[PDB]
DNA sequence: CTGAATTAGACAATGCTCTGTGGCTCTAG
RNA sequence: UAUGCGCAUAACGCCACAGAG
């Protein structure tokens, strides 16, 4: 348990967007989420190379 | 039948403005234009 | 008095003639001067900084070089000019200009055209001359560039702005927005301070340092300070792009000059020969240069180059050289553009901090307005663009890089520049700061706050809106911070902050005030005469021997240029001739000069030396030169050495040289229309001129040329029969706040105890106090309504049942009707469907429409989708609403009460306004009394008085002369009268004191305040009741709500408020595992049965009862892996 | 690993920007989420006003509104002794005093009262008071969510609440055209409240618990005496203590 | 009682001063002029053949002093000075030589009868507003040693420090006026900064002592059967019941 | 109607978890860093998926078939490739 | 605004009194002399003529039409 | 005896039995103890101790011990939506049968 | 060749509730 | 969830200013 193999998701209805007439706002939780995620991509592409 | 007059800032000329074209006064070109007010029954109270 | 003298036409007493003058309403000739020097520090800022302060800034950019494959090329800018405010190109307008009211109603920027001659070189050789379109300014109104200058005040009325119109704003998307003067450090000035946060700055830094705010013509500031180190070393600080750096002083001091080291040591010394610490100091500082292989100028010049080129950003092709060069101009007090006086004002600064640490001066104190000065809004818009000019210039560079990288085909630069389309614009950049405050720089322009920089200059009243160009305004870090000493009122902001013209609260201290007769220093003049004249006098220059001990002699400073040293035997004698010059404008000495002359006390006082201001953004103010019998301008720091007298008593031989030009001249304008404020308590004064801003007044007299979001109108507002002069100097009957009122102060009715107030409901029911306030709501349908096609016009389907005879045939509402709630509040059609929607009016008043106004677009090419509705919403005085005198007495409506059940006087008369005395002992307004006596005279005899403060003495009282009128006229010596009673019949025992007190109707009303939930939205995280009442929400039961009903012992009622009423959801956990998180649904074949996904029994699910908070909180745990186990039994 | 520390903690990661609020500042601080959401919240069925002064009301009581009184609603079951009282707030409907605004039926569905007709209220006031249904639902009657009416029992509260009589049960009386809540004087110095534009928030209790400990323990007659040091705090205050010397 | 048939006002009647108390008080001013150097000569024990130009030389050394201990012996002694002819003016005014007596005089009758106000503010309306006192001292010097624009460097009158010795009936001169604007700003800045002092203190303490109640046995205990006291308040009793007994 | 909870929290204890037992709580893997399509609906093995909660009422659930009123909520995890330190643990990790 | 057609203290017709008092005052009469040439006796009617503001001839030079 | 000399400087007396438990409680572990977050260590309570200050601290302190809250606290009785034990909750009411 | 007290740095806290408006939330490459 | 008539529309934060007690 001092190391992580994979992050949580927590549930989308703790996570909502913030619609305002035809734009969306995501708020901090996924961004933070999201920006874990691209890098995680980015290093699975790498060990493929 | 009883057109939309709108009335110039500038030059307080009357203007007809149908919903297709451009809102601008046919004399001098001024961009703010304000709606008459027509003849219709409102009701107050005098109190 | 004295004739040219901007305060002669000051009247005598307050006449009431104007309002019955047969001339009243025909508009004059020319507008009246004394409220156009309400702004003219915002004006004459801005006119220097957009004529001659631009060309003095691109000046001042350095010619823009770069590498392109082969060969440098240079840019620079040889002119910027400001257009004024026209049309677009490609216009069909009889009229070319653009006028404030337009941008006013149709929402725009009121923009002026930035465009610079931009010439470029290559090889050194300069091959063409480019003028070249930079981005859109916006345009102060009634500047130089605005197209309201020099009109009539006919022809304001003309272009539907105000006759007696001043401008210090700029219209930034439809509002008027005003750059309030922030305080500044003192500029070109060594502020020696103590502060103790700088020992933990490096090893062994002391407390001690002399600051410093060098700017160059308003167009450049860098803050920089010498530190003290305990073996008497002296550190540089200096920042450059918002980080700081530290340099020994023997670097800076050997780098400026190309003098011996000995020559260095007798200028450092140069005042105190004999302290053997500072001699061992100052050779030891000398010394540490010399030990790194720096012997020469340019040796120090070629190491401070080699240290400081990574973060200094030159090409890589200038020498090690002229990178130092670069950043002692950029960095090393900038004021001065030669290097000796660089020399000469660091030696001084240095001077000032060795006596400073030693004990021997004392402390400049910063929170003293003696060591401030304010900063303009010519300064801010002039350093601002000379940052973004910069930056244009680095984006042309960066553009020559991208197509260096992308498009390297070995294109010549043969006029191909068509690149500078590929530039930024500065457009956005430019109207962020005037649009939002906040500050968006690389380098800080000097200033220790990034936002509250621009403000809303709104104009609920008039008394209002002279209250943002009075305003000089502390810090937005300060109000953070939790300290009393930025707050307290010092003397030495006599006469240039009002004392009492503060808010209260958390700006208390903060955001003060300009008296009526101060005034910021925005002229600028060339002062290339005045050192020669200064040594045609006793002033040795800094070159020449001094003819005597520098021990007993004083350093000469001219606008932070150390001129030279006066023998201390002659420097009163050159005082007083400055003074004699400057007071009969003869040597162009300016009339705004400081001359401050700090003896030589031999004790620790402050720094003693001849030191001479004439640059801008200082205060000053009229005083009366009783030795020439002229009116002197004298400055901050000039005042603390005169002793200037406030009565004609006061005036001693000998000793007061000044004299105050009025008794009350230490006093805002707004505070100057306090009647008989002298008579009140202090804090008393202060809440009235916070809420003599609050009154709904009559704000302005365009009310179909003004699209804003609230405007508050009183309907019929009258004179105060009992007003100051200043009332009748400044006009102010253009707007008048109030409404006389039979004010009698009884304890009757049980409603008026604790600050709350009777109204008779008969004048009530006349027109007594009645308003109106008058929305503007502007709907775009290109900005809110993106559904997409962009064919949206306002109209309706001809045959529609939504619209039928309550919208009009254009799908917008007749200008005489009303809207309930719920009514067709506009309707819109799409063009390329054809289906027409309808929007409902959803607010909860009554409102009459009173306008609409149909806008274009910039080029009158616009389509029918923008207008700007504005409605009247009636709000008459209901109970619950706030009124105040003119002292501070603030008060809710508590009662409409009956004229029958009021108590009338022998006279026939009953009050409109009951007043309980209680509110008179803790508060001690006794100017409320007087004010009453005094209406009541003057309504007696048809008159009109004087409430002037400080008018009346202890011989010649205040109440023996309202007696002494109120006795001429029949009534009684103390004010009170024989009233009956409505209720009874009888004569009431006691004597009741009535009179005539001017009320103000605040804004604060009860239909802007009252709210109730019963069940609505919420909040879609936690399932808790939203904040607001436009948004119909929820209030908060907080903490303290919450201890305080578990001290009644109330624990179900806790339970109510804050579980069964906020958020009762109902869990599903395993009754086994103990976890929330562990129970999920089959899916169907019903069933409709829970499985435990831990131990897969679906027997041990049952349902708890938590928050919905609780489930939010134990699924944000299980997102950091933290186990939340319960235990359900 | 920095991005997973600004995900669990967005202060652990100095020197990166793009960073927004971590699960730390969703639960640390002011604004988190135990101060802002747990110890204390927003709730329903509260109003706040401006408060003027009343003497033609009792010490324990308030002055209620038309405009709060005809829409904070309280959920009486009926009962074969109140229904015809509950018959005519039916009746009455959601927009005359005393009314009601809407019937909650015995499966939990929302019958709501119309403002507009009386025949469709008329038809739900007939239909109180009837036994189980076709639905198996037999375990409830119907509960009328009728408008908190004279007596009704309501808990005043003025921010800052510094010590306990600064909440307090007062009964209701309902008072028309106005918009301010009506406060004894006895009560201002309880409450520290002055009438020079001061607010006040009434919470009214929604179960029977809540208003029978509202009754007993939080009434105004029993917060007399200051906790502080047992002496008084309710008390006449300006114009009596000079009339009645 | 107030309506019907007695009235209650507050005239200027009720705040006048008699002619002869009047000759009283201002001669009493005009002896509180020459009380200057004494007090000066009394901190710095000088003897009192010493001249004006080194009471005021050893004045100017105790200012621009780092150790800041004579100064404020100096401010000392001052107000210690004047508050004697403070004492005199009220006594030559207050009780008698007001024009109307108790019960009589209105505001004697509000602020005697507990209705509303103070016996220093009627003082301060109709003696003189005494000594200007900002944080315990008298209000601040210049840096050039003179406490403002109108006064000389360090003068010994009292008016030149803070003694207003005006008054609300009459009116207040521009010095005056602008040290009871120090004072009142001072007081405004103080009321806002008090209060988050005092309310982070009371959260601290509320989130340690709240689980603290009394048990049935008569012991307090928190809320894991920790006993800290074993009767509360070491008697058992009640404090708002305690008062009679 | 029927009052569903009768049960009531005697305790509740703070732990940690095992990775075993999030990867038996967690209902689907989430890959994708897209986490709207073109035409406005959430993705496949995005943040969020529907296998995870519906944000709002317009849309149903996967792994049960709730709509947003009644769906509890369900977790996804992002696979890391290689091992990261549990920042709550990095300070006692260090210690150790 | 516009003169107020009572007095806000007692019902005293007040507003077709406006250009009376302005003629007498073009007349030469002092104000007190023109309130007493109006039977303005009681100073509840007279502070109502005395304190009026006419803001209505400022706020007409703002017509619209012009023509 | 000191809380008593502060507040007796500006008129104000406090009853001596909220001083005596005042002061019992800060003196019941045998020291001295002050009332700020360094003092709700000791605390039986997590839920409490998260509810006052440095939540994520004390959370993280839980979570490492494996700390047990026996949701008695007021502070834990209304995180986890439960009648608070003092006043009205210290007894249950039971119907005969 | 290592436990010792000390000192600098890091960090966490700093009253309560309520009402509005206005700009921006992904512009720069 | 609110409005309107089961149906149609609207479903927010962060800063900064200003204000109330
Ligand atoms: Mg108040
Ligand atoms: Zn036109
Ligand atoms: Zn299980
Ligand atoms: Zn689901
Ligand atoms: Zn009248």
Same mark, same amino acid.
């Given at each position: 348990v001092f190391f992580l193999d994979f992050l949580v998701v927590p549930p989308s209805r703790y996570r909502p967007v913030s619609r305002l007439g035809d734009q969306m706002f995501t708020n901090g939780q996924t961004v933070n989420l999201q920006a874990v995620m691209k890098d995680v991509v980015l290093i699975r592409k790498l060990l493929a190379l | 039948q009883q057109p939309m007059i709108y009335i110039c800032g500038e030059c307080h000329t009357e203007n007809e403005i149908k919903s297709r074209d451009p809102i601008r006064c046919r004399e001098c070109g001024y961009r703010i234009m304000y709606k008459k007010r027509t003849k219709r029954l409102v009701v107050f109270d005098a109190r | 008095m004295d004739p040219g003298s901007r305060w002669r036409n000051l009247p005598s007493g307050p006449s009431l003639k104007?309002?019955?003058?047969?001339?009243?309403?025909?508009?004059?000739?020319?507008?009246?001067?004394?409220?156009?020097?309400?702004?003219?520090?915002?004006?004459?800022?801005?006119?220097?900084?957009?004529?001659?302060?631009?060309?003095?800034?691109?000046?001042?950019?350095?010619?823009?070089?770069?590498?392109?494959?082969?060969?440098?090329?240079?840019?620079?800018?040889?002119?910027?000019?400001?257009?004024?405010?026209?049309?677009?190109?490609?216009?069909?307008?009889?009229?070319?200009?653009?006028?404030?009211?337009?941008?006013?109603?149709?929402?725009?920027?009121?923009?002026?055209?930035?465009?610079?001659?931009?010439?470029?070189?290559?090889?050194?050789?300069?091959?063409?001359?480019?003028?070249?379109?930079?981005?859109?300014?916006?345009?102060?109104?009634?500047?130089?560039?605005?197209?309201?200058?020099?009109?009539?005040?006919?022809?304001?009325?003309?272009?539907?702005?105000?006759?007696?119109?001043?401008?210090?704003?700029?219209?930034?998307?439809?509002?008027?927005?005003?750059?309030?003067?922030?305080?500044?450090?003192?500029?070109?000035?060594?502020?020696?301070?103590?502060?103790?946060?700088?020992?933990?700055?490096?090893?062994?830094?002391?407390?001690?340092?002399?600051?410093?705010?060098?700017?160059?013509?308003?167009?450049?500031?860098?803050?920089?300070?010498?530190?003290?180190?305990?073996?008497?070393?002296?550190?540089?600080?200096?920042?450059?792009?918002?980080?700081?750096?530290?340099?020994?002083?023997?670097?800076?001091?050997?780098?400026?000059?190309?003098?011996?080291?000995y020559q260095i040591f007798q200028e450092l010394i140069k005042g105190k020969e004999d302290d053997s610490f500072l001699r061992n100091?100052?050779?030891?500082?000398?010394?540490?240069?010399?030990?790194?292989?720096?012997?020469?100028?340019?040796?120090?010049?070629?190491?401070?180059?080699?240290?400081?080129?990574?973060?200094?950003?030159?090409?890589?092709?200038?020498?090690?050289?002229?990178?130092?060069?670069?950043?002692?101009?950029?960095?090393?007090?900038?004021?001065?553009?030669?290097?000796?006086?660089?020399?000469?004002?660091?030696?001084?600064?240095?001077?000032?901090?060795?006596?400073?640490?030693?004990?021997?001066?004392?402390?400049?104190?910063?929170?003293?307005?003696?060591?401030?000065?304010?900063?303009?809004?010519?300064?801010?818009?002039?350093?601002?663009?000379?940052?973004?000019?910069?930056?244009?210039?680095?984006?042309?560079?960066?553009?020559?890089?991208?197509?260096?990288?992308?498009? #390297?085909?070995?294109?010549?630069?043969?006029?191909?520049?068509?690149?500078?389309?590929?530039?930024?614009?500065?457009?956005?950049?430019?109207?962020?700061?005037?649009?939002?405050?906040?500050?968006?720089?690389?380098?800080?322009?000097?200033?220790?706050?990034?936002?509250g920089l621009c403000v809303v200059a709104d104009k609920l009243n008039f008394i209002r809106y002279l209250s943002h160009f009075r305003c000089v305004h502390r810090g937005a870090d300060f109000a953070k911070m939790r300290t009393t000493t930025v707050r307290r009122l010092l003397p030495e902001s006599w006469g240039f902050l009002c004392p009492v013209?503060?808010?209260?609260?958390?700006?208390?201290?903060?955001?003060?005030?300009?008296?009526?007769?101060?005034?910021?220093?925005?002229?600028?003049?060339?002062?290339?005469?005045?050192?020669?004249?200064?040594?045609?006098?006793?002033?040795?220059?800094?070159?020449?021997?001094?003819?005597?001990?520098? #021990?007993?002699?004083?350093?000469?400073?001219?606008?932070?240029?150390?001129?030279?040293?006066?023998?201390?035997?002659?420097?009163?004698?050159?005082?007083?001739?400055?003074?004699?010059?400057?007071?009969?404008?003869?040597?162009?000495?300016?009339?705004?000069?400081?001359?401050?002359?700090?003896?030589?006390?031999?004790?620790?006082?402050?720094?003693?030396?001849?030191?001479?201001?004439?640059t801008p953004c200082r205060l000053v103010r009229p005083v009366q030169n009783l030795a020439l019998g002229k009116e002197e301008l004298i400055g901050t720091m000039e005042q603390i050495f005169m002793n200037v007298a406030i009565f004609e008593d006061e005036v001693f031989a000998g000793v007061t040289t000044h004299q105050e030009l009025f008794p009350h001249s230490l006093l805002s304008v707004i505070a100057n229309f306090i009647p008989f404020s002298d008579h009140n308590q202090s804090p008393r004064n202060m809440y009235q001129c916070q809420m003599g801003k609050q009154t709904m007044g009559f704000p302005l007299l365009t009310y179909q040329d003004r699209s804003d979001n609230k405007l508050y109108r009183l309907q019929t507002p009258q004179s105060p029969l009992v007003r100051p002069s200043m009332y009748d100097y400044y006009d102010m009957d253009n707007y008048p706040i109030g409404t006389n009122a039979i004010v009698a102060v009884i304890s009757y009715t049980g409603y008026d105890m604790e600050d709350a107030m009777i109204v008779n409901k008969a004048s009530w029911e006349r027109g007594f106090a009645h308003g109106s306030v008058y929305?503007?709501?502007?709907?775009?349908?290109?900005?809110?309504?993106?559904?997409?096609?962009?064919?949206?016009?306002?109209?309706?389907?001809?045959?529609?049942?939504?619209?039928?005879?309550?919208?009009?045939?254009?799908?917008?509402?007749?200008?005489?009707?009303?809207?309930?709630?719920?009514?067709?509040?506009?309707?819109?059609?799409?063009?390329?469907?054809?289906?027409?929607?309808?929007?409902?009016?959803? #607010?909860?008043?009554?409102?009459?429409?009173?306008?609409?106004?149909?806008?274009?677009?910039?080029?009158?090419?616009?389509?029918?989708?923008?207008v700007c509705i504005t409605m009247r919403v009636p709000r008459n005085p209901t109970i619950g609403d706030k009124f105040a005198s003119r002292h501070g007495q603030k008060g809710i409506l508590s009662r409409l009460w009956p004229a029958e059940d009021m108590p009338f006087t022998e006279s026939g008369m009953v009050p409109d306004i009951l007043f309980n005395p209680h509110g008179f002992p803790s508060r001690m307004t006794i100017g409320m009394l007087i004010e009453s006596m005094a209406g009541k005279s003057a309504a007696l005899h048809g008159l009109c008085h004087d409430a002037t403060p400080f008018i009346f003495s202890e011989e010649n009282s205040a109440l023996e002369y309202f007696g002494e009128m109120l006795k001429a006229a029949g009534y009684n010596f103390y004010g009170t009268?024989?009233?009956?009673?409505?209720?009874?019949?009888?004569?009431?025992?006691?004597?009741?004191?009535?009179?005539?007190?001017?009320?103000?109707?605040?804004?604060?009303?009860?239909?802007?305040?009252?709210?109730?939930?019963?069940?609505?939205?919420?909040?879609?995280?936690?399932?808790?009741?939203?904040?607001?009442?436009?948004?119909?929400?929820?209030?908060?039961?907080?903490?303290?709500?919450?201890?305080?009903?578990?001290?009644?012992?109330?624990?179900?009622?806790?339970?109510?408020?804050?579980?069964?009423?906020?958020?009762?959801?109902?869990?599903?956990?395993?009754?086994?595992?103990?976890?929330?998180?562990?129970?999920?649904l089959e899916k169907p074949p019903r069933n409709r049965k829970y499985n435990c996904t831990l131990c897969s029994r679906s027997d041990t699910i049952d349902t708890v009862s938590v928050p919905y908070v609780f489930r939010y909180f134990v699924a944000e745990l299980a997102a950091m892996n933290i186990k939340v186990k319960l235990d359900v039994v | 690993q920095s991005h997973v520390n600004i995900v669990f903690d967005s202060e652990m990661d100095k020197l990166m920007m793009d960073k927004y609020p971590g699960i730390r500042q969703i639960l640390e601080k002011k604004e988190?989420?135990?101060?802002?959401?747990?110890?204390?919240?927003?709730?329903?069925?509260?109003?706040?006003?401006?408060?003027?002064?009343?003497?033609?009301?009792?010490?324990?009581?308030?002055?209620?509104?038309?405009?709060?009184?005809?829409?904070?609603?309280?959920?009486?079951?009926?009962?074969?002794?109140?229904?015809?009282?509950?018959?005519?707030?039916?009746?009455?409907?959601?927009?005359?005093?005393?009314?009601?605004?809407?019937?909650?039926?015995?499966?939990?569905?929302?019958?709501?009262?119309?403002?507009?007709?009386?025949?469709?209220?008329?038809?739900?006031?007939?239909?109180?008071?009837?036994?189980?249904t076709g639905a198996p639902k037999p375990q409830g009657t119907k509960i009328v969510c009728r408008h908190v009416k004279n007596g009704d029992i309501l808990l005043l509260n003025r921010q800052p609440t510094l010590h306990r009589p600064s909440i307090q049960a007062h009964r209701a009386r309902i008072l028309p055209e106005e918009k301010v809540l009506r406060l004894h004087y006895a009560?201002?110095?309880?409450?520290?409240?002055?009438?020079?534009?001061?607010?006040?928030?009434?919470?009214?209790?929604?179960?029977?618990?809540?208003?029978?400990?509202?009754?007993?323990?939080?009434?105004?007659?029993?917060?007399?005496?200051?906790?502080?040091?047992?002496?008084?705090?309710?008390?006449?205050?300006?114009?009596?203590?000079?009339?009645?010397? | 009682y107030l309506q019907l048939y007695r009235g209650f006002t507050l005239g200027v009647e009720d705040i006048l001063v008699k002619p002869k108390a009047d000759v009283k008080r201002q001669r009493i001013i005009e002896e509180s002029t020459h009380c200057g150097p004494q007090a000066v000569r009394a901190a710095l024990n000088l003897p009192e053949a010493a001249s004006y130009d080194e009471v005021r030389g050893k004045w100017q050394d105790a200012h621009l002093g780092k150790d800041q201990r004579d100064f404020n012996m100096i401010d000392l002694k001052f107000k210690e000075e004047v508050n004697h002819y403070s004492n005199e003016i009220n006594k030559a005014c207050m009780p008698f030589g007001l024009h109307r007596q108790f019960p009589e005089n209105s505001l004697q009758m509000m602020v005697q009868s507990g209705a509303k106000g103070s016996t220093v503010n009627t003082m301060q309306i109709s003696c003189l507003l005494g000594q200007i006192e900002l944080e315990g001292r008298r209000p601040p010097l210049m840096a050039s040693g003179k406490s403002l624009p109108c006064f000389e460097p360090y003068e010994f009158t009292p008016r030149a420090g803070g003694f207003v010795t005006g008054r609300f009936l009459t009116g207040i001169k521009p010095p005056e006026f602008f040290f009871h604007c120090m004072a009142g700003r001072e007081g405004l800045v103080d009321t806002a900064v008090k209060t988050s002092r005092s309310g982070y203190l009371q959260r601290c303490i509320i989130k340690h002592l709240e689980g603290l109640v009394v048990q049935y046995d008569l012991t307090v205990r928190d809320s894991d059967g920790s006993v800290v006291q074993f009767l509360y308040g070491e008697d058992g009793l009640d404090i708002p019941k305690t008062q009679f007994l | 109607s029927k009052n569903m909870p009768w049960r009531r929290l005697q305790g509740i204890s703070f732990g940690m978890y095992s990775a075993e037992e999030l990867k038996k709580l967690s209902v689907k893997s989430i890959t994708n860093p897209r986490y709207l399509d073109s035409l406005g609906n959430p993705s496949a093995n995005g943040l969020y998926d529907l296998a995870l909660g519906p944000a709002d009422s317009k849309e149903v659930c996967s792994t049960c078939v709730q709509d947003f009123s009644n769906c509890s909520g369900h977790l996804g995890h992002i696979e890391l490739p290689l091992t990261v330190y549990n920042p709550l643990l990095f300070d006692k990790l260090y210690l150790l | 605004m516009i003169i107020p057609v009572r007095c806000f203290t007692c019902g005293k017709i007040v507003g077709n009194k406006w250009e009376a008092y302005l003629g007498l005052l073009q007349a030469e009469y002092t104000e007190g002399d023109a309130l007493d040439a109006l039977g303005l006796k009681r100073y509840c009617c007279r502070r109502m003529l005395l304190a009026h503001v006419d803001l209505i001839e400022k706020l007409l030079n703002y017509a619209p039409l012009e023509k | 005896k000191e809380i008593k000399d502060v507040f007796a400087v500006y008129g104000i007396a406090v009853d001596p039995r909220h001083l005596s438990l005042v002061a019992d409680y800060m003196c019941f572990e045998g020291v001295y103890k002050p009332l700020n977050r360094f003092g709700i260590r000791s605390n039986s309570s997590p839920l409490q101790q998260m509810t006052f200050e440095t939540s994520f601290q004390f959370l993280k302190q839980a979570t490492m011990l494996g700390s047990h809250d026996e949701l008695r606290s007021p502070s834990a009785c209304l995180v986890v939506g439960k009648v608070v034990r003092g006043g009205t909750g210290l007894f249950e009411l039971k119907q005969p049968l």
């Open positions: - | - | 104007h309002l019955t003058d047969p001339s009243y309403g025909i508009p004059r000739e020319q507008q009246k001067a004394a409220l156009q020097e309400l702004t003219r520090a915002h004006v004459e800022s801005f006119n220097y900084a957009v004529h001659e302060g631009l060309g003095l800034a691109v000046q001042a950019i350095p010619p823009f070089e770069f590498a392109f494959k082969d060969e440098r090329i240079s840019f620079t800018i040889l002119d910027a000019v400001i257009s004024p405010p026209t049309v677009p190109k490609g216009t069909i307008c009889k009229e070319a200009n653009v006028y404030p009211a337009e941008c006013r109603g149709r929402r725009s920027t009121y923009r002026g055209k930035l465009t610079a001659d931009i010439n470029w070189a290559v090889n050194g050789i300069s091959k063409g001359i480019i003028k070249q379109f930079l981005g859109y300014v916006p345009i102060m109104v009634k500047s130089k560039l605005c197209n309201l200058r020099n009109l009539p005040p006919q022809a304001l009325i003309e272009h539907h702005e105000e006759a007696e119109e001043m401008g210090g704003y700029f219209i930034i998307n439809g509002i008027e927005k005003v750059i309030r003067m922030l305080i500044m450090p003192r500029r070109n000035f060594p502020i020696a301070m103590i502060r103790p946060k700088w020992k933990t700055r490096g090893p062994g830094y002391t407390q001690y340092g002399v600051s410093m705010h060098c700017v160059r013509e308003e167009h450049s500031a860098v803050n920089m300070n010498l530190h003290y180190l305990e073996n008497g070393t002296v550190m540089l600080n200096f920042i450059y792009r918002k980080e700081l750096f530290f340099l020994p002083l023997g670097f800076a001091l050997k780098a400026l000059v190309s003098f011996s080291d100091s100052v050779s030891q500082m000398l010394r540490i240069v010399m030990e790194e292989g720096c012997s020469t100028q340019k040796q120090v010049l070629n190491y401070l180059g080699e240290c400081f080129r990574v973060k200094l950003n030159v090409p890589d092709w200038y020498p090690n050289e002229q990178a130092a060069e670069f950043l002692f101009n950029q960095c090393i007090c900038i004021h001065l553009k030669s290097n000796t006086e660089k020399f000469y004002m660091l030696c001084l600064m240095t001077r000032k901090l060795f006596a400073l640490a030693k004990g021997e001066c004392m402390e400049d104190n910063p929170d003293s307005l003696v060591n401030q000065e304010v900063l303009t809004p010519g300064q801010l818009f002039l350093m601002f663009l000379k940052e973004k000019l910069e930056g244009w210039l680095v984006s042309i560079k960066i553009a020559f890089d991208k197509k260096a990288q992308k498009t #390297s085909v070995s294109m010549n630069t043969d006029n191909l520049m068509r690149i500078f389309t590929m530039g930024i614009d500065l457009t956005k950049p430019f109207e962020y700061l005037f649009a939002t405050g906040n500050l968006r720089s690389k380098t800080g322009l000097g200033l220790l706050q990034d936002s013209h503060t808010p209260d609260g958390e700006p208390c201290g903060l955001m003060n005030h300009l008296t009526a007769v101060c005034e910021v220093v925005t002229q600028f003049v060339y002062t290339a005469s005045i050192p020669a004249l200064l040594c045609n006098l006793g002033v040795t220059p800094i070159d020449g021997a001094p003819h005597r001990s520098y #021990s007993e002699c004083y350093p000469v400073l001219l606008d932070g240029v150390m001129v030279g040293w006066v023998d201390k035997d002659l420097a009163p004698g050159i005082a007083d001739s400055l003074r004699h010059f400057k007071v009969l404008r003869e040597k162009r000495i300016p009339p705004w000069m400081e001359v401050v002359l700090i003896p030589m006390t031999g004790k620790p006082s402050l720094y003693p030396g001849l030191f001479l201001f004439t929305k503007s709501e502007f709907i775009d349908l290109s900005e809110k309504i993106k559904q997409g096609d962009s064919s949206l016009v306002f109209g309706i389907k001809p045959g529609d049942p939504r619209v039928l005879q309550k919208l009009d045939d254009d799908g917008l509402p007749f200008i005489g009707a009303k809207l309930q709630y719920g009514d067709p509040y506009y309707s819109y059609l799409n063009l390329n469907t054809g289906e027409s929607f309808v929007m409902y009016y959803k #607010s909860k008043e009554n409102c009459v429409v009173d306008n609409i106004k149909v806008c274009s677009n910039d080029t009158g090419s616009g389509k029918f989708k923008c009268e024989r009233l009956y009673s409505g209720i009874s019949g009888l004569e009431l025992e006691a004597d009741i004191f009535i009179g005539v007190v001017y009320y103000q109707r605040l804004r604060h009303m009860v239909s802007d305040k009252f709210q109730v939930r019963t069940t609505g939205a919420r909040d879609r995280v936690t399932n808790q009741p939203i904040g607001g009442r436009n948004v119909q929400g929820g209030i908060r039961f907080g903490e303290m709500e919450r201890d305080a009903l578990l001290a009644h012992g109330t624990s179900f009622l806790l339970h109510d408020r804050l579980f069964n009423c906020s958020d009762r959801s109902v869990a599903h956990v395993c009754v086994k595992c103990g976890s929330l998180l562990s129970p999920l | 988190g989420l135990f101060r802002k959401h747990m110890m204390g919240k927003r709730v329903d069925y509260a109003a706040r006003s401006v408060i003027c002064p009343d003497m033609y009301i009792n010490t324990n009581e308030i002055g209620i509104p038309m405009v709060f009184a005809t829409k904070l609603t309280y959920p009486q079951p009926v009962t074969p002794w109140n229904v015809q009282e509950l018959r005519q707030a039916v009746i009455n409907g959601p927009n005359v005093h005393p009314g009601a605004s809407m019937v909650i039926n015995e499966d939990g569905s929302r019958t709501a009262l119309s403002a507009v007709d009386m025949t469709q209220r008329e038809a739900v006031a007939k239909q109180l008071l009837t036994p189980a009560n201002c110095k309880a409450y520290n409240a002055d009438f020079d534009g001061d607010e006040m928030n009434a919470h009214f209790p929604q179960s029977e618990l809540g208003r029978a400990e509202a009754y007993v323990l939080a009434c105004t007659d029993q917060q007399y005496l200051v906790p502080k040091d047992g002496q008084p705090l309710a008390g006449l205050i300006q114009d009596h203590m000079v009339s009645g010397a | - | - | - | -």
